[PDB]
Design a protein around this nucleic acid. Structure first.
Lengths: 50, 61, 92, 127, 49, 52
RNA sequence: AUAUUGGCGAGAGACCGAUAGCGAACAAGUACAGUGAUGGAAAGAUGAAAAGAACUUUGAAAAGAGAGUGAAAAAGUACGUGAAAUUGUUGAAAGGGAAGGGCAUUUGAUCAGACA
RNA sequence: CGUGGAGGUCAGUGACGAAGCCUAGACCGUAAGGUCGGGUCGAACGGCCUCUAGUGCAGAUCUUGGUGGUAGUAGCAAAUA
């Protein structure tokens, strides 16, 4: 944890950047099937296994 | 929306609906049957009395 | 019974039941909920029975709403009736 | 009027329901022979349902006649109907369920013209 | 933007009625758990107190 | 496909388990785990006598 | 000349039709699980066109009732059809520690057909 | 008797409504089943002669899914409020 290595921090940064709900303008595109972020993650709710 | 059975004139009638409504179904069936066929103002008064514990909803089924 | 062997119990209940049964039946018959006689002009014996058609002609002649006519079926009956009227128009 | 026939006797007017078709929804009313070795229905005990057997076969002189006294024939068009032109006292045309209303009025016109009896003339007609 | 908010709200119905705490709850419950069907308990120790 | 219905890793749960003894998928966390696996009667299992 | 369950490009089928066909018709080897080797799903259908219900009104709001679009909301992003189990309401009926089933008939309800 | 697909045929049925589903409305068959009426539906489907088969379920502590009674019940009484 605190006193990380950089590799872990880079993967956590990617996880933070992916911690995004769906942008609304996506839903308005033609022939859109994506409705929710199916790959959404939460810290208490599913661990990322490093 | 399609209502359930209906046996009254639509010009002289009014409808209300609540769907997917998060309240216990058994208790709601008991309280709705307590005011079936009642006069509307009398039914509202009775329900306000039920909140006030002066009268109770009879639980039949 | 075993406490009142000298009163009819089953027979009294059956008399009461037949009385109440046909009082209820006569109440239904007087309100006209029963279907009319086969010879009546209001009967449909030998003719197709349709809830949709009956509601359509009841709305045209101008309530019961458990028996409901959909706007889809109402439009279909209007279209079919236009066809039938055109057929009678070519007949006459 | 129809071709003369005796009384139409049905030796078993009730339908032969399946054994426990009433007890269970999963058991349909379509008749099935009870194949159990200890089936009281198959062993034909007293007080159980009757099973189909050839003794209930209808009279040959009357086996396919409707109560009106005609054998029912399914017609889909005028061409099918005209095969009963010479058999009008022995056959009554029934209009298939999927014939549309306009084709039905054509069929009724031809049938009345030839005198062929039509079983369900009321049909899809909502004149 | 109102249409977007309406569609986003009208989508979550099935996930909410499964109490899915949002988009991040994809916990799956197995069809049967083999530890629950212990077997023939009473010989030796058993699988739970 | 001859691998149709066979690719699953599953084994029977044994006797005395108050369940039918059909092979059930191992592992966990997927809903597929614990389900009948190989038989023709089973959803996802092989067909009886795969067409050759 | 031979082999070819791989790769690349094609053409077919008396094949399967969303519990089927590859595990995967869909952001499927995904989600998820396991320290790990590995295991591994569920999930297609509004409508021709979003025209996805402006506006009024009740409600804190979800929504409701009107209105409206649409051929049809008996198509309202729970969306083609919409079975059964199971349930609500209405109408009828039965019920003195089963219910169901067989034969027959009462009663009530319902209902088809025919012209010397 | 019934079902999926194939060859032939009825110049078969079908948006004036195919299939499907619902229906104490009807008819034929000893039966498997077949036929018709009404409602619903909305785009395909039958008869006959044949061909073919992944062809018919009440069960297998069957498989997958859904749903009940239990039941508004057990219960939500550890950590002073």
């Amino acid at each position: 944890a605190a006193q990380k290595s950089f590799r872990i921090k880079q993967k956590m940064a990617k996880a933070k950047k992916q911690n995004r709900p769906l942008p609304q303008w996506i839903r308005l595109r033609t022939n859109n099937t994506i409705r929710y972020n199916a790959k959404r993650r939460n810290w208490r709710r599913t661990k990322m296994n490093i | 929306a399609r209502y359930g059975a209906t046996s009254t004139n639509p010009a002289k009638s009014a409808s209300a609906r609540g769907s997917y409504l998060r309240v216990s179904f058994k208790n709601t069936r008991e309280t709705a049957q307590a005011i079936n066929g009642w006069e509307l103002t009398k039914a509202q008064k009775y329900l306000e009395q039920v909140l006030d514990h002066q009268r109770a909803i009879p639980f039949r089924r | 019974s075993k406490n009142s062997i000298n009163r009819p119990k089953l027979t009294s209940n059956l008399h009461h039941k037949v009385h109440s049964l046909n009082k209820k039946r006569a109440q239904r018959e007087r309100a006209g909920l029963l279907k009319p006689a086969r010879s009546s002009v209001n009967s449909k014996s030998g003719e197709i029975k349709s809830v949709a058609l009956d509601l359509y002609f009841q709305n045209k002649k101008n309530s019961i709403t458990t028996r409901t006519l959909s706007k889809k079926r109402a439009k279909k009956i209007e279209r079919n009736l236009k066809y039938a009227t055109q057929r009678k128009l070519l007949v006459d | 009027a129809s071709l003369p026939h005796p009384k139409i006797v049905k030796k078993h007017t009730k339908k032969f329901k399946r054994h426990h078709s009433d007890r269970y929804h999963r058991v349909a009313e379509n008749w099935r022979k009870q194949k159990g070795i200890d089936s009281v229905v198959r062993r034909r005990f007293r007080g159980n349902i009757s099973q189909p057997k050839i003794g209930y076969g209808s009279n040959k002189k009357t086996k396919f006649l409707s109560p009106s006294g005609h054998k029912t024939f399914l017609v889909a068009n005028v061409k099918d109907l005209e095969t009963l032109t010479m058999h009008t006292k022995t056959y009554a045309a029934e209009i298939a369920h999927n014939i549309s209303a306009k084709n039905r009025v054509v069929i009724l016109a031809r049938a009345k013209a030839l005198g062929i009896k039509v079983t369900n003339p009321k049909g899809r007609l909502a004149l | 933007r109102s249409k977007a908010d309406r569609m986003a709200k009208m989508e979550r119905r099935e996930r909410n009625r499964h109490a899915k705490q949002g988009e991040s709850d994809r916990h799956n419950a197995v069809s049967l758990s083999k530890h629950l069907f212990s077997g023939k308990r009473g010989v030796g120790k058993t699988d739970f107190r | 496909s001859e691998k149709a219905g066979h690719q699953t890793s599953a084994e029977s749960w044994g006797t005395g388990r108050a369940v039918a003894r059909i092979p059930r998928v191992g592992g966990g966390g997927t809903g597929r785990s614990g389900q009948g696996a190989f038989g023709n009667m089973c959803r996802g299992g092989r067909m009886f006598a795969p067409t050759k």
